[PDB]
């Protein structure tokens, strides 16, 4: 029912949750409240698949069983740069020794 | 006479007794066979508790009967 997410861009990671029935657009409104860019300036991705505003998270493939709080699913985020969008880029976390 | 004494768990002890033998005697023989002190033994036959004063013949316990043994629950 609930999906637990990491919304990731460059060196930014937002931890948040949402319903399977909530929309990609609603997800963009959460990003807007935090990172102060409107939804029309955002692209969200499941891996390399660009997500559409009107689709639910469930319709996008996110499921409660694979987006658990201790192992959240990653949503990629790209911002509009000037007239075009930046390439999706997520900086990896560091590594153990 | 050969009689049997069974706790509820399932252990069975065969005893050699005479109908003249008292219940105190039967508990004493159980102590010989199993090392259980008589004051920790409760004997039941036909749903009634067996008193130490009476003998086995007084309770209509014939050969090949089984008595039920209840033990003090020192370990709950």
């Amino acid at each position: 029912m609930d999906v637990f997410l990491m919304i990731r861009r460059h060196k930014t990671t937002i931890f948040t949750d949402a319903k399977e029935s909530s929309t990609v657009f609603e997800l963009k409104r959460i990003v807007e409240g935090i990172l102060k860019r409107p939804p029309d300036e955002q692209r969200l991705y499941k891996d390399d698949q660009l997500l559409d505003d009107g689709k639910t998270l469930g319709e996008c493939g996110f499921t409660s069983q694979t987006a658990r709080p201790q192992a959240p699913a990653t949503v990629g985020l790209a911002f509009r740069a000037d007239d075009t969008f930046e390439a999706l880029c997520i900086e990896p976390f560091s590594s153990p020794p | 006479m050969q009689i049997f004494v069974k706790t509820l768990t399932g252990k069975t002890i065969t005893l050699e007794v005479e109908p003249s033998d008292t219940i105190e005697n039967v508990k004493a023989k159980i102590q010989d066979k199993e090392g259980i002190p008589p004051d920790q033994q409760r004997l039941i036959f036909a749903g009634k508790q067996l008193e130490d004063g009476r003998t086995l013949s007084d309770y209509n316990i014939q050969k090949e009967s089984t008595l039920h043994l209840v033990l003090r629950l020192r370990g709950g």
Partner: protein
Amino acid sequence: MYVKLISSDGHEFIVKREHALTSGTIKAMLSGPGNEVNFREIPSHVLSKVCMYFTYKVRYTNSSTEIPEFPIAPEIALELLMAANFLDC
């Protein structure tokens, strides 16, 4: 509503304030005298795992349904232990 936790390598983790209060250390920092917290000694691969613990702990508190455990790999266990002790979580 949200707070920002910055790792030693400069990753910024944005998490609900209520979830971040799972850490006694962060709770004290957010009520310091006179937002965001910078952790000069916790790297991102550890701090991301800590944030996952926050999410897990808040979601499953007073839960009795069978759930997966919180997974801790051998290669991270010592560092994660040191972060959990420092953060009091």
